Amino acid sequence: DEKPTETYSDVGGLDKQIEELVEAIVLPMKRADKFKDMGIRAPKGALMYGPPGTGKTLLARACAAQTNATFLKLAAPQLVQMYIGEGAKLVRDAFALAKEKAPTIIFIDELDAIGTKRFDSEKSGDREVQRTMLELLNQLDGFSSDDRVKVLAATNRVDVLDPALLRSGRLDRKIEFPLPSEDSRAQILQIHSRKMTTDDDINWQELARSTDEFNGAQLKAVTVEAGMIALRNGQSSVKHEDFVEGISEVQARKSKSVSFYA
């Protein structure tokens, strides 16, 4: 997918950790020439980690808002059939196209878990993976030349990918994608349910407090397996207990067989 994107959605989740970030990024995109007039080796990117269930790409979609720019299209791409780092070959021509159209939004995915922690697991010859990461550096090298590119990644939190990022000329900065409040996690469940017939005649706010440690990853999954049961029953209207305790309880606990209660 490649486009000058649309409007950023409602900020919502994590937002107090986010307003301080477009601060960090648009200025590299806005009058970094003035920074280059001020004469600084201002960065070409940073990193935003945290567990998924977040809306990471929305912030990527928020990237080109204050300055129009185009997205990225690559996902575990370098895992090829051939000897080559064919992606890494493409990374040159692709980062060359990030060199094209200086207003540009660059976000690869799973930098960690495409790049292991310390790549002790694999043999000496990794298929040029340090070479690919050498491309990333040698492409970050070309990216360090200019202010055209602006780069970021996302994966498991930290200490799961390569430790190269410590140099400020390389990456220089890290943010996390923490666990948010849930009133927006309430709204998104309508968005998950937006493609499905249902109602909302529930007090799911006390509910939203009751659960925790069930990520948007989880909560992007919940919405369907209790739509089936009320259909399996035959109902159509959405409802609290059949979905809330019907999903939140069935996660790990079930088979209520307790006697000494009352």
Binding site: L79, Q81, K195, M196, T197, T198, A221, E225, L231, R232
Partner: protein
């Protein structure tokens, strides 16, 4: 083209050739048939249907009887995906199987998989992962909006990266386990329906003697009573004959 033969000549199974606790079948029967036959029930709510019945059940349990049951019922075409024909020493040539399979499969109709024992190939100088990567390339494309499913089984669910097992792959998963005595009773009726016995006795109290155990030993243990009857020359079976050996099958195991 080693497994280039869809199905056998005669599957001999029924959904009532099983005790199987009656509950693990419904959603399994629901996912496989209701999108298949009644998508108006899907659009009755306007749903996002699943694509796979993820599963784990210890072997020696009638999931596989249950697996061979949907074969004989639906009458559609069928497969068998196992490391023998799948996994081959020639690197990359192993993935000719998956491609000719699925690229064919999208063409065909009701050619749903039973690619069981993927715990063989799907486990974490070894090239197995790249075949597992060859899979997921095929699935994210067609995954929704089709009569087709991805329903198989295993022995070791914690023996595979769930990087493949994201929610769009096998959502409404499956779990098996041993029965109650009543589940152990209704299954016992099945293999009891062949021989001569002391008709009209209290079979159910033997299903009291089904602690944590498989049905497979029960379809066994009746024959040892007949073997016990053979040595006893009992032309027709009794109660104590079932006892005289079932007391020994577990104690010899214990």
């Amino acid at each position: 083209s080693v497994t280039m033969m869809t199905v056998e000549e005669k599957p001999d199974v029924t959904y009532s050739d099983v005790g199987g606790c009656k509950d693990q079948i419904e959603k399994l029967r629901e996912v496989v048939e209701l999108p298949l036959l009644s998508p108006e029930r899907f659009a009755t709510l306007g749903i996002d249907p699943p694509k796979g019945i993820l599963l784990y059940g210890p072997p020696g349990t009638g999931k596989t009887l249950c697996a061979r049951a949907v074969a004989n019922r639906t009458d559609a075409t069928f497969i068998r995906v196992i490391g023998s024909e799948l996994v081959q020493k020639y690197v990359g040539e192993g993935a000719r199987m998956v491609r000719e399979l699925f690229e064919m499969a999208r063409t065909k109709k009701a050619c749903i998989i039973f690619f069981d024992e993927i715990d063989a190939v799907g486990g974490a100088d070894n090239e197995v992962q790249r075949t597992m990567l060859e899979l997921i390339t095929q699935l994210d494309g067609f995954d929704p909006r089709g009569n087709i499913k991805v329903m198989f089984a295993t022995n070791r669910p914690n023996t595979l990266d769930p990087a493949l097992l994201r929610p769009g792959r096998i959502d409404r998963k499956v779990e098996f386990s041993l029965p109650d005595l009543e589940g152990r009773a209704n299954i016992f009726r099945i293999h009891s329906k062949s021989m001569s016995v002391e008709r009209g006795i209290r079979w159910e109290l033997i299903s009291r003697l089904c602690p944590n155990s498989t049905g497979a030993e029960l379809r066994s243990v009746c024959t040892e009573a007949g073997m016990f009857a053979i040595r006893a020359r009992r032309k027709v079976a009794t109660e104590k004959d079932f006892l005289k050996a079932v007391d020994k099958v577990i104690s010899g195991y214990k």
